Ligand binder design. Structure first.
Ligand SMILES: [Mg+2]
Ligand SMILES: [Zn+2]
Ligand SMILES: [Zn+2]
Ligand SMILES: [Zn+2]
Ligand SMILES: [Zn+2]
Lengths: 206, 67, 46, 51, 404, 1131, 115
RNA sequence: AUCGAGAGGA
């Protein structure tokens, strides 16, 4: 009975981050699960049931998303930062729903993206000249720069290659940032391993 | 109508910051200092909080369909 | 079978059969709304 | 002199650097609506039966 | 299929295309084939007609296919050429100081359909292997065509003095045996004019080879522009303090000149020229002064531009814009005209209630002495809106008469 | 005391805010309607003549008073209840109030047997009510009260609800009346023509135009003629003067030439005298007028009577229509001749047709008054016939049954419902385009539609002069907002502080002029008019004066003190020609301005102080006007005003420009309208770009109104996450764009990235779109009603069945309920059924007439409403909800004319990123900037970067010297960014830096109504039209695309004859006919029995089959209908 | 209406091969690897690792259409070597590099949390 | 469904 239609609430629930640290590796994709639509091996059940009976506006927040799995809960609800606001309700308005959370990654939808920004940089002093500043004096210095203030950019390195890449991986909350990096390395390595397996089948089949 | 959950650009959660942002503004913070207190350092998330219009508060001035 | 409607003004749940003038029994208001179905509609939160 | 015709479609145009100059990128719904009457022969009997 | 856009003005507004089924719900077009249709992607819609017989299909395939439509009989030149990003980028790519590394070169060669698989010997072997942009466009260029053109910035006094065949500015395009021996490619070399590379490709090589030439230029150049990048911002609209002072001095001198002409006319010290009344002669003198001011300020802005300026990049390549646009963005917007004359006295002997009566000065009658970056004053804003309304009316009223 | 420059930008905007707290944006509509109801209806009722009817007994039936109650609604039981506008919208009612008139019928037969019977409150009609007017139930309600009634507090009102449809009256331009305008047509028999559209103060007849022309040179000299109304032949002016009682030539030239020392005027009038010497007395001149007329009476007596009546009623009604006014009419016609001679002698300029001082805006009030005059006249006529047919029998009659109230009610309702402005019978003489459906797509579109003006020159006209932006539109009409299609310059929009005058009576002004030293026109001698100054009031020359300067000082003092002269009265002193023209009539567009003392504003700092505490001490705009600090100046009085653009102009300068200013702009940005006031930095764009944005702000998605949950609109788009712009102008505070914005601040990068944004296209971030970026919801309402019109056939909502219904499609009806209506929350795909309606037959005894979804929509039912319509059968509205996620082909626009469709969407890892991992929401092509010169886009992007990094809202008000690009760049360099808004970006695919540093930052983008899914269409052998068996027209009809004449010509040039035949014969309307080989006329074929015969030739063997288009067969048959014999000869 | 499901970028259709090897006939000892349901993420690393092999004469990749979800990697090697062998070794080297990077990131995290 | 009108798009 809230003022936001159903797809608004659904979209809004999809974007709430859920703690995924140790559970995401264990759960299966519903593609791979041998069950029906759902099961505890490939999904997590959430329930939300709020009714504004009192005169002040009721803030239906992520704290009202009750899970069957204690490990997978809304990040803000984890034991400061306030809870994500799902909808504001007026006296007499009511929201009752039943969600299921799945395993996915950011290629399918940004809600499965664990990062709240990935700062990536290399060659802070423009030594490789991969950028060409028309007026190098006008540009601020990188936080990773090692140059005296009179010097705007490093002397050009003809024999140089990009090395020393700087990262700042900010987490949306679902995974720890170091878990994001470790899971990224493992996922890239398994992509390459699967590619090599299929490569071997194609080579031997010829 | 309501504060978005994530920042459209980076995907940082801003849904839990609207109420805190308003509370800081009535605490006589400037909008910039308030956005700094909430940890919105990229101008995309500052855009999200600073340009938000809480229309849901006006939609809650109408009685619902059922009592 | 009942087709209970809600009043646009008094928000009263009242049953009205076919071939009946559309009138709320509590306040006589002439605009009524159907209630949300019981069927199961699914949303991908995307 | 001018008239309405069948087997026509219309939609917004969009850039595509990855088409050749003589190509047009068509939606699958326009192409699923529009049809071409292909004559059956022993050369195409199997393919047309598949379709 | 026949692909059509309205208004169907000439035979190139309905051309044959081969269908490529793709995910979303729009008609996806190549970017060279947009100029024949007069089509841009600001909500334009186009009509697809599917021939329903082998005879009509053969007809369209042998008569109306786009490669057969590259050269128009209207003006014996190409009707489609290289266009915005590909033209700015090919201009930047064929500059003399574009050096590609081995991995970049292989990346670009992945996007050549007509590539024999042989990596060319780099133009620079030591201290580090480097290919040039001309060396890769030579691979894009088909057959063994031969072509001489001149880049738009080619100085006119260079073909006389020395260095005629070794151009300091890398102008004077020369393609020999299908290799870009020298020169910066631009609108003059890849556009829709007569004798360009696309025209000579169509005349010497067939329409199929020319189709592949268009496609290969676009793919290779767009994938290189992913490295180079092209942009535009406030920094391209800005000029140095010296340029601003020169422009303001020019405008001040021009306004004093107009004041002098006004004082002469007021004192009857102005005599009419043959073929005009005194009012028309005064108007001619004032308009000449202000046009001279606009041109001088525009030249000042143009010379102030650096080689990194993106306005200058797009104007030089011919992709978009003109030197007058740069002058209006940097130097001065200039005189606003209604029906070919200065702003009329719509009030009683006034253009606006903010002026005195009988004020034939430049600002009173609609001279915008500001640039678009500087911003127009309210009266300049209204006069500019009047001048722009004239263009909107012309565009909306000429169509019926021209179509009839 | 004085407001210093450092405070000025606050003071002026404080003043502006006070204006919008007092007036609003739709004040002209409300004031027009209020004047129409308070005054115009009563004047129209009283100005009608009493209808005296007698066989004997007689009855007069005088109407004396009107009463307009509040809007009410009568049910079938007849109980009157107060009807709320939302109930009218939902139930398809008409938000109208009943008009009752007091009638007085006195019986007079003989012998002083008189007795009066008064019928108090006789229900004379129903008048639709403009919302938020004084007579609206939403009048004076608080925002809480409006929300209690399911109304938006931000809704401006200013429109009517007719049959549930919100209709807005467009102000109509017209040439002002009672004013002499001397023009010169290049191609005509006349050299100069002085016209005067004359109309009496309280309108009762159309405008009677009188022309006074001069015949073009080539008998001896130039002759002056006068084209009087109701006379089809030119008449010499001297004849007209003699017909008015001025026979002596001296008297006529006393009335025409006021300075006898001027022989030029004399010799130029002499030909007219020489042409009229045989006629020398009043009766003969009247006979001449009657003879030249189109009804020449055989007897001179009735000729003279007709000429008398014409010269007393139709000639110059504004001068006076009573008798003994011939002196005033003679003076005025002499003034017309004087003006014509001044134009012909070059002493006066020809009048400009385009000058808005010469124009009037016909608003809702004066337009409804035109309707009401016509309709009340028709009603009184019908009453006359009804009462006559009864008194002819010599018996009393009931006026309640004589008054058929449907005339006024149905007339006003029809005219506002259709827009055809006039009687329903004269549906072709009526002028359409008035009263359009209110645009509810976004709040800006609604405001602009409510502030819309119309120049009825005709779109077909290709003369650019009326389309040109005249100089006099300054401050009155937006220079930018205008449609760019076929109505460039004709459809206009009010500037923000523009106020259309509502009208006023000249009686107090005339009375004061009498008490003052003015001399009436009948009391003077003409010899005094030479040096004296004429005084016109609403076009009527009322007298003369001796010191016009101190008269103007007195009148300006009176108007600035809110004395007898009201604020909207215009008072123009033309000095070179000694007229003083005072105007009180309606339709005069004017604007407020700050009065200026010697060289100082009268707006001191105390006024700003009292305006700052506007909410405590109730010091409002009206107190500012009453203080003599602000003045409304109309277009015609601006000609006599010397404006200061800013108080900086009032400073003493090294060379003084004026030093004698009289007024000052409150702020120059008020020259813009509603949609142009949203453009940031519009003075840094090319003006066509500002016009295109002013058009495209109206298709932008947002929240068109707060109470959208209860409205059953046919089409509605609501944006999920509207944002206020980071870079805004100070005018949007009054447009309420901050409370109902129509866009999102997007991190836009102007770059060439992959080539998918070329030629006016954009690359959007798929990840941002996944997060709700520019997502919208599309609400579509379907209406249906079950009609019990008669026992022959009745419709009914009920779940159809396969065994009883006949025209039942194969689509499943399971989603419907037993009531026949789908339930909310049910997901419905294309071609699905939402209402099951069945109609009883004369597959038996009932046929299926169900309502399907508009094909290819795929929404969810948002809600279902059931009620009863006006007549009272069951009536259903179903709102279906479809979430529109932006995709390739959807149109987006910035506020600078920069429109484009989404070329492609890349995920966040595929988009280019800054060192701090910010990816652009949108990437637009740099080639869209240079030709367009939308530098406001770049300045807005840079200002928005500063605003987002600083935590403020950028000030992009047009003309602001405290904000330039260098300041913004210096501010941006303080937040660790390149001062010009560039950043090093990295390629998302490879991670390498892009060599060219990209220009990136927040810019306010808009999602426009034009989504590709509402435009994509295809056909392959669908339905065909009935008349010509060709494909239908439209997506909705599953129609085919038109292969037009130009396509035929293109394919002829191609030489593609078989493709041309396929398109124009085989893919459109293939057909076969049988032709007689002898007469070539279509024969009769019977293919079942194989008997072919031509009845004409009486043969049945020489028939031939011909394959021709059906349209060609239809053409040949329509030619045979015309007795033409198109014989298709096959040999 | 025409929106492909988002999983079609990652998931293989039934009967569709993850990788297909086609001999390039223009030059000797060259192959085209058409890899389905991958994008620049694997293409760029495989190409750049192949460029580190001195026996690789050409190594390039392209996404022929962004709306389509395949990549093509062209590899040419010296005659004594093979493009299939080069591609295999490139994947092996990338896997070993990522394993080492993962172990070293684990060690760095342990050091950072401990001290 | 037709017709007309209006509003829009390129
Ligand atoms: Mg277009
Ligand atoms: Zn499962
Ligand atoms: Zn962010
Ligand atoms: Zn009720
Ligand atoms: Zn015959």
């Amino acid at each position: 009975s809230s003022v936001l239609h159903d797809e608004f609430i659904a979209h809004r629930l999809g974007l709430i981050p859920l703690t995924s640290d140790d559970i995401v590796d264990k759960l299966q994709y519903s593609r791979d699960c041998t069950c029906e639509e759902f099961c505890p091996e490939c999904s997590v059940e959430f329930t939300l049931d709020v009714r504004c009976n009192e005169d002040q506006t009721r803030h239906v927040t992520s704290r009202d998303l009750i899970s069957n799995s204690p490990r997978v809960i809304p990040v803000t609800s984890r034991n400061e930062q306030d809870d994500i606001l799902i909808v504001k309700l007026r006296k007499g308005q009511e929201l009752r729903l039943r969600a299921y959370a799945k395993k996915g990654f950011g290629k399918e939808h940004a809600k499965w993206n664990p990062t709240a920004g990935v700062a990536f940089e290399y060659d802070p002093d423009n030594a490789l000249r991969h950028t060409v500043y028309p007026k190098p004096e006008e540009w601020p210095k990188s936080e990773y720069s090692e140059l005296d203030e009179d010097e705007s950019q490093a002397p050009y390195d003809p024999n140089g290659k990009p090395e020393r890449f700087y990262y700042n991986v900010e987490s949306c909350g679902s995974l720890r940032p170091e878990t994001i990096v470790l899971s990224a390395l493992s996922g890239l390595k398994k992509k390459l391993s699967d590619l090599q397996t299929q490569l071997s089948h194609e080579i031997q089949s010829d | 109508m309501i504060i978005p959950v994530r920042c459209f650009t980076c995907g940082k959660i801003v849904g839990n910051k609207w109420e805190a942002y308003l509370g800081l503004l009535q605490a006589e913070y400037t909008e910039g200092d308030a956005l700094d207190a909430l940890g919105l350092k990229r101008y995309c998330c500052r855009r999200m909080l600073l340009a938000h219009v809480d229309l849901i508060e006006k939609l809650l001035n109408y009685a619902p369909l059922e009592k | 079978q009942p087709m209970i409607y809600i009043c646009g003004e008094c928000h009263t749940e009242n049953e009205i059969k076919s071939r009946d003038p559309i009138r709320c029994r509590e306040c006589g208001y002439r605009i009524m709304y159907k209630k949300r179905t019981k069927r199961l509609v699914v949303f991908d939160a995307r | 002199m001018g008239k309405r015709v069948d087997f026509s479609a219309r939609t917004v145009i969009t850039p595509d650097p990855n088409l050749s100059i003589d190509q047009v990128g068509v939606p699958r719904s326009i192409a699923a609506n529009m049809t071409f009457a292909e004559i059956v022969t022993p050369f195409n009997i199997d393919r047309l039966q598949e379709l | 299929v026949i692909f059509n856009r309205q208004p169907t003005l000439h035979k190139m507004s309905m051309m044959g295309h081969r269908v490529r089924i793709l995910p979303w719900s729009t008609f996806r077009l190549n970017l060279s084939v947009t100029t024949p249709y007069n089509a841009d992607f600001d909500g334009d819609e186009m009509n697809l007609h599917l021939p329903q017989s082998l005879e009509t299909r053969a007809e369209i395939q042998e008569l109306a296919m786009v490669p057969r439509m590259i050269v128009t009989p209207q003006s014996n030149r190409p009707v489609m050429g290289i266009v915005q990003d590909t033209l700015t980028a090919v201009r930047k790519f064929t500059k003399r100081d574009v050096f590609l590394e081995r991995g970049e070169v292989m990346n670009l060669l992945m996007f050549l359909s007509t590539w024999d698989g042989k990596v060319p010997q780099p133009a620079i072997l030591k201290p580090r292997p480097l290919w040039t942009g001309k060396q890769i466009f030579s691979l894009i260029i088909p057959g063994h065509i031969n072509c001489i053109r001149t880049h738009s910035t080619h100085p006119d006094d260079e073909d006389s003095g020395p260095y005629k065949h070794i151009s300091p500015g890398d102008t004077k395009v020369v393609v020999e045996n299908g290799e870009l021996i020298m020169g910066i490619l631009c609108k003059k070399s890849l556009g829709t004019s007569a004798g360009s590379l696309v025209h000579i490709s169509y005349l010497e090589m067939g329409h199929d080879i020319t189709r592949l030439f268009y496609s290969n230029i676009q793919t290779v150049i767009n994938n290189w522009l992913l490295i180079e990048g092209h942009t535009i911002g406030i920094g391209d609209s800005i000029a140095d303090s010296k340029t601003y002072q020169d422009i303001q001095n020019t405008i001040k001198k021009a306004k004093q000149d107009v004041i002098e002409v006004i004082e002469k006319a007021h004192n009857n010290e102005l005599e009419p020229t043959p073929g005009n009344t005194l009012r028309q002669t005064f108007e001619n003198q004032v308009n000449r002064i202000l046009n001279d001011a606009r041109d001088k300020t525009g030249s000042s802005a143009q010379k102030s531009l650096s080689e990194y300026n993106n306005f200058k990049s797009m104007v030089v390549s011919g992709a978009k814009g003109s030197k007058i646009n740069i002058s209006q963005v940097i130097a001065v917007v200039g005189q606003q005209n209604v029906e070919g004359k200065r702003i009329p006295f719509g009030f009683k002997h006034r253009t606006l209630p903010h002026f005195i009566k009988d004020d034939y000065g430049p600002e009173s009658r609609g001279f915008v002495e500001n640039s678009y970056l500087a911003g127009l004053t309210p009266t300049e804003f209204f006069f500019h809106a009047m001048g722009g309304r004239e263009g909107l009316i012309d565009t909306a009223v000429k169509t019926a008469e021209t179509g009839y | 005391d004085e407001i210093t420059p450092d405070l000025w930008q606050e003071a002026c905007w404080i003043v502006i805010s006070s204006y919008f707290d007092e007036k609003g944006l739709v004040r002209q509509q409300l004031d027009s309607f209020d004047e129409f109801i308070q005054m115009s209806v009563q004047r129209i009722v009283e100005d009608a003549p009493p209808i005296d009817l007698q066989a004997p007994p007689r009855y007069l039936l005088k109407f004396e008073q009107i009463y307009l109650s509040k809007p009410t609604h009568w049910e079938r039981d007849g109980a009157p209840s107060p009807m709320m506008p939302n109930e009218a919208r939902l139930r398809n009612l008409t938000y109208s109030a009943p008009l009752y008139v007091d009638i007085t019928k006195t019986v007079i037969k003989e012998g002083e047997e008189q007795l009066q019977t008064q019928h108090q409150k006789t229900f004379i009609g129903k008048i639709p009510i403009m919302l938020r007017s004084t007579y609206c139930l939403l009048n004076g309600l608080t925002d809480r009260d409006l929300c209690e009634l399911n109304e938006c507090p931000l809704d401006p009102g200013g429109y009517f609800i007719i049959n549930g449809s919100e209709k807005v009256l467009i102000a109509q331009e017209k040439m002002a009346t009672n004013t002499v305008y001397v023009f010169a047509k290049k191609d005509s028999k006349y050299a100069y023509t002085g016209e005067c559209r004359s109309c009496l103060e309280n309108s009762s007849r159309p405008t009677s135009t009188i022309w006074v022309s001069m015949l073009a040179r080539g008998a001896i000299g130039q002759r002056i003629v006068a084209t009087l109304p109701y006379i089809k032949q030119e008449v010499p002016i001297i004849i007209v003067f003699r017909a008015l009682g001025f026979v002596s030539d001296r008297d006529i030239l006393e009335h025409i030439i006021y300075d006898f020392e001027d022989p030029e005027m004399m010799e130029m009038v002499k030909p007219s005298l020489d042409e009229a010497f045989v006629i020398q007395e009043q009766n003969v001149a009247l006979n001449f007028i009657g003879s030249r007329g189109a009804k020449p009476g055989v007897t001179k007596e009735k000729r003279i009577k007709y000429a008398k009546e014409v010269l007393q009623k139709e000639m110059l009604p504004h001068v006076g229509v009573s008798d003994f006014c011939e002196t005033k009419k003679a003076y005025f016609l002499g003034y017309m001749v004087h003006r014509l001679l001044l134009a012909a002698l070059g002493r006066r300029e020809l009048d400009d047709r385009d000058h808005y001082g010469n124009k009037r805006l016909d608003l809702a009030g004066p337009l409804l008054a035109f309707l009401f005059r016509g309709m009340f006249k028709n009603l009184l006529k019908e009453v006359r016939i009804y009462a006559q047919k009864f008194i002819d029998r010599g018996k009393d009659f009931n006026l309640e049954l004589a008054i058929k109230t449907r005339i006024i009610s149905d007339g006003l309702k029809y005219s506002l419902a259709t827009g055809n402005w006039g009687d329903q019978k004269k549906a072709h003489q009526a002028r359409a385009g008035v009263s359009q459906v209110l645009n509810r797509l976004t709040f800006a579109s609604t405001l602009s539609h409510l502030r819309r003006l119309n120049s009825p020159i005709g779109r077909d006209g290709k003369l650019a002069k009326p389309r040109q932006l005249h100089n006099t539109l300054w401050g009155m009409v937006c220079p930018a907002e205008t449609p760019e299609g076929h109505a460039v310059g004709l459809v206009k929009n009010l500037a923000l502080m523009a106020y259309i005058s509502v009208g006023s009576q000249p009686s107090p002004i005339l009375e004061f002029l009498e008490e003052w030293s003015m001399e009436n026109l009948e009391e003077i001698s003409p010899a005094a008019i030479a040096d004296a100054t004429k005084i016109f009031v609403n076009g009527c020359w009322v007298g003369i004066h001796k010191d016009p300067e101190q008269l103007m000082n007195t009148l300006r003092k009176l108007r600035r003190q809110m004395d007898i002269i009201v604020s909207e009265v215009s008072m123009i002193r033309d000095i070179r020609e000694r007229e003083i023209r005072i105007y009180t009539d309606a339709g005069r567009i004017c604007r407020p301005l700050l009065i200026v003392e010697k060289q100082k504003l009268l707006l001191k700092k105390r006024h700003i102080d009292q305006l700052k505490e506007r909410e405590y001490n109730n010091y409002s705009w009206q107190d500012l006007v009453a203080s003599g600090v602000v003045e409304y100046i109309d277009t015609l009085e601006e000609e006599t005003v010397m404006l200061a653009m800013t108080p900086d102009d009032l400073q003493e300068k090294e060379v003084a420009y004026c030093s004698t200013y009289t007024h000052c702009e409150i702020h120059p940005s008020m020259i813009l309208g509603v949609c142009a006031s949203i453009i940031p930095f519009p003075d840094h764009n090319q003006s066509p770009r500002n016009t295109y944005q002013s058009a495209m702000g109206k298709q932008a998605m947002g929240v068109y109104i707060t109470n959208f949950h209860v409205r059953m609109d046919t089409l509605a788009h609501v944006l999920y996450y509207p944002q206020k712009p980071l870079v805004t102008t100070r005018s949007m505070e009054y447009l309420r764009f901050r409370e109902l914005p129509a866009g999102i601040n997007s991190i836009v990068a102007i770059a060439s990235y992959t080539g998918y944004n070329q030629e006016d296209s954009v690359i959007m971030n798929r990840s941002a779109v996944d997060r709700g970026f520019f997502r919208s919801v599309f609400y579509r309402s379907y209406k249906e009603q079950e009609s019990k019109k008669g026992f022959d056939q009745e419709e009914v909502f009920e779940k159809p069945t396969r065994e009883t219904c006949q025209g039942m499609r194969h689509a499943i009806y399971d989603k419907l309920d037993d009531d026949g209506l789908i339930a909310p929350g049910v997901r419905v795909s294309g071609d699905d059924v939402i209402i099951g309606k069945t109609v009883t037959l004369p597959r038996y005894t009932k046929r299926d007439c169900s309502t399907f979804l508009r094909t290819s929509e795929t929404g969810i039912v948002d809600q279902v409403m059931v009620t009863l319509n006006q007549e009272g059968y069951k009536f259903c509205k179903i709102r279906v909800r479809s979430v529109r996620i932006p995709q390739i082909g959807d149109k987006f626009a910035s506020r600078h004319g920069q429109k484009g469709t989404c070329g492609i969407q890349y995920r966040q890892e595929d988009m280019p990123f800054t060192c701090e991992g910010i990816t652009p929401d949108i990437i637009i092509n740099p080639h869209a900037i240079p030709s367009r010169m939308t530098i406001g886009h770049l300045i807005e992007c840079l200002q928005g970067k500063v605003s987002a990094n600083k935590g403020e809202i950028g000030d992009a008000t047009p003309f602001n010297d405290a904000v330039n690009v260098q300041k913004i760049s210096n501010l941006l360099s303080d937040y660790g960014y390149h001062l010009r808004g560039n950043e090093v970006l990295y390629n998302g695919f490879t991670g390498r830096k892009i060599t060219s540093q990209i220009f990136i930052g927040p810019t306010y983008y808009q999602r426009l109504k034009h989504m590709v899914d509402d435009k994509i269409h295809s056909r392959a052998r669908g339905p065909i039209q009935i008349l010509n068996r060709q494909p239908m027209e439209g997506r909705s009809r599953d129609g085919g695309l038109r292969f037009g004449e130009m396509e035929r010509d293109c394919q002829i040039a191609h030489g593609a004859a078989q493709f041309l035949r396929e398109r124009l014969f085989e893919a459109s309307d293939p057909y076969q006919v049988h032709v007689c080989n002898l007469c070539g006329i279509m024969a009769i074929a019977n293919t079942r029995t194989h008997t072919y015969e031509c009845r004409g030739c009486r043969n049945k063997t020489q028939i031939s089959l011909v394959r021709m288009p059906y349209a060609c067969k239809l053409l040949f048959q329509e030619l045979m209908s015309m007795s033409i014999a198109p014989r298709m000869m096959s040999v | 209406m025409n929106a492909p499901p988002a999983f079609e970028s990652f998931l293989l259709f039934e009967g569709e091969k993850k990788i297909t090897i086609n001999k390039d006939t223009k030059v000797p000892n060259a192959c085209l690897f058409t890899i389905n349901k991958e994008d620049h993420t694997l293409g760029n690393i495989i190409k750049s690792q192949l460029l580190k092999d001195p026996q690789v004469l050409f190594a390039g990749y392209k996404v022929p259409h962004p709306l389509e979800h395949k990549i093509i990697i062209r590899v040419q090697t010296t005659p004594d070597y093979s493009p299939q062998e080069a591609f295999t070794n490139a994947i092996t080297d990338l896997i070993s590099e990522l394993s080492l990077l993962e172990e070293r990131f684990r060690v760095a995290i342990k050091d950072k949390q401990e001290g």
